[PDB]
């Protein structure tokens, strides 16, 4: 979950390893693009990336300084629209957003749902269910993870 | 630190 | 059992002559709800009507007595009890024969012989007798004399019009009054929703859906695991029938028990 | 109408239709190679003989549980009948209920009990009026200065003079001091007509 | 051949009795086989060309 | 067989707000009406095709051979008069406006009966509840009796059954001692069996000397 | 002499002729004490 603004948690990482040995899951969410890589590889001990919010049309915000290798991958995704909500512009109306990711069988699963909150000062007590979006049908044993924050 | 997770969390589960 | 399947329908056929007994069993049931109904209600052979005057001595019985405003054509406590085709697998539900109309009916011809005959339209003959002599003579069969009623007649009218109208308000106020008609109707769903879940429950088989046991796997082994099936269904289905049986005689219990009492109160006064 | 013993042969019917159902199922196949155990003794290896033959006895254990659980339900209705029938013995042979409908349509007069095949028939005698006749009826009559009521009995007319007659027979009687008694005045029974009563 | 030879088969006998006897079971068979799947799915540079 | 769903049913139009992203649709018993269109993105519902049963309604072999047969539950436009009545398509009997004595029950009140109307035909009614007997109640009007009719009614009440008792390990097993020995296993049923067959037979007796023997001296 | 495949049916302890005088002593009973004999 993330309540307090926006545009920080613009990606996450997935692996049990992360010493290249199983494929990773990269759910950065930059300008005007989302695509997802399940490539096998190791990057580094601290994924560090800063916004660069950049306004133009046609930049690349996800530097190269994430990862230092890359390998054959298995799946990959070029959807358009960003996986990622809107942000509201108030005085005290925030944006409130919650993702259900989750790992069965072979499917990932990444639930996921938007909510504005009424109160700046009040905890959010209030109950939103969270339907799927997207399915990847890719199946690998993972039991850590790495938020990616900006 | 630490918080609660008052109720929030709950999905649709399968799509039916 | 078996639904589309034809190779289930012919093992079924060897498991003996179990269904035939279970549709003998229902069609038992069904008849004696009916015959229920019929000792109850059917008591009288002449239909009654109410006078036109509705002036009984003093006594309102607008609130018993059937309403002609409503198209429904039944009285207004009968209303208030009433307001307190799905073939989804094999199990169907019978209408029963006497509709509601004819048990208001019924009912109708019932308060008007206890009205203008009282108890003579239960043992013969209906022989006309006013309400006030009706109830005096009432009085007379539990030792008080009649004098009482003739000289406060109008107490025992406004203490009778306040007991009927206090009545509809206790049925009101307290929606847990019908315990028994809903618990029963609570019954019957709760025996039909476990009798349609109990299909999608796996008694041995790799699934529980017949055409997949068909197509996945080799006939030899699909009869095997039909066969466990079909047990355990016809186990399922015996255990309800045999559930249906019992609280048919508590049913049956229930409705003779309920005729004996529309026999000894309505059409007579009993002393016990 | 030899169909007046309904109950008596739809009992006997059920136990012979339970009885040839009971002995019919042990024909039936309930996973074997056929019905006969000499002949899955014999076919077959002992092995799977074992195997087919604890299918064929959990099917006939089934049948005959399905068949004394009928039994004890059928029993439970007849406990329950003979109990009524002895009560209707205790209450209409031994004596002359008061109960409606009990004892059989109408004001029960006697029952003669017979025997029967597995039941008990009664011959109730009822007391059924008819040739009914409309009259003129009244609460109470009014006196000089004081109310007579019926004692046993309803004041009827015939158009012109006023009797007391029995509430099941008519027997017209004249109006005396014998069958009535006096309760106050003639100033709060409504209906109340005035007549001479007979000292 | 009828349903009065029906009744005389469900029951054992032949003299039947005056009333509603149940015979059997009806249950209208499917007619048409619609199987309909998802929309386009792939479609091939065919255009262009032509 | 939409997108997989594998069912046989009558697939009407609906009114169901899908959410966007549901696919299938089912009910309260696990079963799966509501299917969504893999193309037309349109929710039609699946309703069971019609079935029921079939009973045939007949007055006798020994009066006539015309029989009718009633199909509970269809609807007449899914299969000589066809009347719908709550029940069932009747098919087989004309409806006559008149009311007789319910002779075969049909169900929801409507009963039928083999008559020679004006020519013997199944005929199908509304039962009727008796005769309207409208009671004169003037205010100073009674009616007394003056003759009576002693009448000697007849009841039918069972007393007892036919006591049963079954030999269990003769019943189940033949005369195969091979048999014998796996009943062993199946546990104490036999004899649970015998002992409420016994109970029953002995209430059976307690039910005839309770209705039977009542009086203790025997009068001629 | 009736026997099946196991199942009896076991003779009635009182015999109809038996029921029948119990038929007969109550008639009697009830022609010449009434109602006196069952109290």
């Not at chain 3, 169907?92 to 009912?107: G, K, N, R, S, W």
């Not at chain 4, 199922?25 to 002949?39: E, M, P, R, T």
């Not at chain 6, 899908?18 to 309703?47: K, S």
């Not at chain 6, 004169?136 to 009719?149: D, E, G, L, R």
Request: aromatic share 10%.
């Amino acid at each position: 979950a993330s309540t307090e603004k926006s545009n920080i948690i613009r990606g996450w990482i997935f692996g049990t390893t992360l010493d290249s040995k199983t494929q990773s899951l990269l759910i950065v969410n930059n300008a005007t693009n989302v695509v997802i890589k399940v490539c096998e590889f190791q990057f580094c001990n601290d994924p560090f990336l800063d916004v660069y919010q950049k306004n133009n049309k046609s930049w690349m915000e996800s530097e190269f300084r994430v990862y230092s290798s890359a390998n054959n991958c298995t799946f990959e995704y070029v959807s358009q629209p960003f996986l990622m909500d809107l942000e509201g512009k108030e005085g005290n109306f925030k944006n409130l957003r919650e993702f259900v990711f989750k790992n069965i069988d072979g499917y990932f699963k990444i639930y996921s749902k938007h909510t504005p909150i009424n109160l700046e000062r009040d905890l959010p007590q209030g109950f939103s269910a969270l339907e799927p979006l997207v399915d990847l049908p890719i199946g690998i044993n993972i039991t850590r993870f790495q938020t990616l924050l900006a | 630190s630490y918080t609660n997770s008052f109720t929030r969390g709950v999905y649709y589960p399968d799509k039916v | 059992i078996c639904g589309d399947s034809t190779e289930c329908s012919n093992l079924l056929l060897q498991y003996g002559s179990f269904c035939t007994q279970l549709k003998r069993a229902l069609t038992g049931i069904a008849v004696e709800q009916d015959k229920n109904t019929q000792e109850v209600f059917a008591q009288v052979k002449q239909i009654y009507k109410t006078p036109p005057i509705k002036y009984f001595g003093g006594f309102n019985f607008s609130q018993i007595l059937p309403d002609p405003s409503k198209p429904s054509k039944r009285s207004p406590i009968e209303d208030l009890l009433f307001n307190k085709a799905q073939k989804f697998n094999g199990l169907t539900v019978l209408p029963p024969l006497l509709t509601d109309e004819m048990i208001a009916q019924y009912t109708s011809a019932l308060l008007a012989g206890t009205i203008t005959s009282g108890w003579t339209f239960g043992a013969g003959p209906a022989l006309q007798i006013p309400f006030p002599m009706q109830m005096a003579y009432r009085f007379n069969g539990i030792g008080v004399t009649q004098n009482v009623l003739y000289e406060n007649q109008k107490l025992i009218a406004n203490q009778f019009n306040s007991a009927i109208g206090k009545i509809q308000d206790s049925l009101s106020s307290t929606p847990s009054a019908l315990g028994k008609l809903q618990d029963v109707v609570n019954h019957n769903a709760q025996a039909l929703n476990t009798l349609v879940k109990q299909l999608s429950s796996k008694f041995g088989a790799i699934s529980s859906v017949l055409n997949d046991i068909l197509s996945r796997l080799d006939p030899p082994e699909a009869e095997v695991q039909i066969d466990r099936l079909i047990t355990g269904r016809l186990q399922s289905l015996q255990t309800y029938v045999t559930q249906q049986l019992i609280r048919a005689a508590e049913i049956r219990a229930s409705a003779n028990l309920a005729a004996t009492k529309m026999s000894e109160c309505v059409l007579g006064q009993s002393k016990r | 109408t030899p169909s007046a013993l309904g109950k008596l042969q739809d009992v006997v019917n059920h136990n012979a239709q339970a009885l040839n159902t009971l002995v019919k199922q042990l024909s039936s196949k309930f996973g074997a190679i056929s019905s006969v155990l000499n002949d899955i003794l014999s076919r077959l290896d002992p092995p799977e003989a074992e195997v087919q033959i604890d299918r064929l006895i959990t099917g006939r254990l089934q049948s005959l549980q399905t068949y004394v659980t009928q039994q004890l339900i059928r029993a439970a209705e007849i406990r329950a009948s003979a109990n009524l029938a002895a009560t209707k013995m205790s209450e209409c042979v031994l004596g002359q209920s008061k109960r409606v409908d009990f004892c059989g349509k109408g004001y029960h007069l006697m029952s003669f009990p017979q025997s029967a095949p597995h039941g008990v028939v009664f011959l109730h005698v009822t007391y059924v009026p008819a040739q009914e006749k409309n009259f003129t009826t009244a609460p109470a009559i009014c006196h000089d200065g004081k109310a007579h009521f019926p004692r046993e009995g309803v004041f009827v007319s015939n158009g012109t003079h006023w009797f007391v007659t029995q509430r099941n027979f008519y027997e017209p009687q004249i109006i005396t001091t014998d069958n009535t008694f006096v309760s106050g005045n003639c100033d709060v029974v409504i209906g109340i007509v005035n007549n001479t009563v007979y000292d | 051949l009828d349903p009065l030879s029906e009744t005389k088969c469900t029951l054992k006998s032949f003299t039947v009795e005056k009333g509603i006897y149940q015979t059997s079971n009806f249950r209208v068979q499917p007619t048409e086989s619609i199987v309909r799947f998802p929309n386009i799915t792939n479609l091939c540079p065919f255009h262009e060309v032509f | 067989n939409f997108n997989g769903l594998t069912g046989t049913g009558v697939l009407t139009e609906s009114n169901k707000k899908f959410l966007p992203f549901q696919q299938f649709g089912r009910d309260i018993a696990d079963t799966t009406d509501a299917v969504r269109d893999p193309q037309t993105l349109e929710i039609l519902d699946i309703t069971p095709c019609s079935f029921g049963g079939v009973s045939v309604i007949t007055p006798g072999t020994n009066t006539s051979n015309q029989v009718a047969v009633l199909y509970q539950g269809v609807n007449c436009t899914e299969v000589s008069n066809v009347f719908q009545t709550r029940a069932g398509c009747l098919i087989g009997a004309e409806y006559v406006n008149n009311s007789y004595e319910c002779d075969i029950p049909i169900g929801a009140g409507i009963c039928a009966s083999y008559q020679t109307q004006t020519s013997q035909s199944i005929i199908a009614y509304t039962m009727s509840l008796g005769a309207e007997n409208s009671v004169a109640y003037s205010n100073n009007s009674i009616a007394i009796p003056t003759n009576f009719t002693i009448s000697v009614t007849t009841e039918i009440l069972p007393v007892s059954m036919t006591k049963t008792s079954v030999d269990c390990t003769m019943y189940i097993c033949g005369d195969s001692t091979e048999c014998s020995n796996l009943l062993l296993q199946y546990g104490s049923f036999c004899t649970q069996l015998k002992r409420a067959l016994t109970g029953i037979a002995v209430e059976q007796d307690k039910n005839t000397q309770e209705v039977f023997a009542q009086v203790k001296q025997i009068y001629k």
